[PDB]
Amino acid sequence: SSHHIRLLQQLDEQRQKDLFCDCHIIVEGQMFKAHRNVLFASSGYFKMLLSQSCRDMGEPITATFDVFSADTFTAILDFVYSGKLPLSGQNVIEVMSAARYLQMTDVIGVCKMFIKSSLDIN
Amino acid sequence: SSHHIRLLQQLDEQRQKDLFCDCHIIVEGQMFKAHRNVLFASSGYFKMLLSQSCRDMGEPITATFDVFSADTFTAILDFVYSGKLPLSGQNVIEVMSAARYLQMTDVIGVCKMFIKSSLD
C-alpha cells in the first residue's frame, strides 16, 4: 500500500509542477493541468474524450467545461490525485453532480456515504 | 486507499495495451511500453533521464539497457505497476543489481528483506 500511496503523491506533485502534463482542463476560465493516463483511468467521461488520441503524442489535449464550477473541479481533481475528498453540506451536491457528469462512480459513492452519515444528526 | 489500488491497476492495464505510452524501453532485444510520469516517480535513473524532456511531448522517449536482462526488467516494471515484486532465490541478486542501476531504493529494500528472511 505504501508503494501506491507514494506513487500517487509523486503524480500529484508532478501535476502541481506541470511535469508530463499532456491534458489541460479549463473551467470558469481557470486552467488545470493533469495527465491523460490518470484522467482516463479515473473517469468514464475522460475515457470517451481521450480514447481517440490515446496513441498520439503532441499538443496537450485541452478540454473545457461549463457544467460545473472551478471550485467543484478542484475538489474532484484533488481526489483523483490523493484519494481524499473534503466535503460539506455546502458542496457535496455540486461535487456529486459533477461526478455524475464525469462518470466517476467512486466519487459518487463517497458523496452518498457523506450525505447518509451527515443526516444522522439526532 | 482503494482509490490508489484501482488507479494503479488501470495504469497497469494501459501499459499492457499500449495506451498513452510515451516511453519505450528496449532490453535484450525486447520492447517495453510504459508511462514517463510513472517511471519518473519510481526510479532515480528514469527521473534523471526524463527530466530534460518532461514538458516536451511528441516522440516517445526510447531508453535502452544492456546491464540487466529482459526477465529482470520485467520483474521491476511489474513491481512499478503493482507493488508486488516477483522474487525467487534464482533472481533476487539480479533484481537487486538492476535496482541499484535504476536507483530504486524501495526495490533494493525488498530484495534485502527477501535475503534476510531466507533463513526463516
Curated annotation (Swiss-Prot), chain B:
The chain holds residues 4 to 123 of 470 of the full protein. May be involved in transcriptional regulation. Residues 21-89 form the BTB domain. This is Zinc finger and BTB domain-containing protein 8A.1-A. It is found in: Nucleus. Transmembrane segments: none annotated.
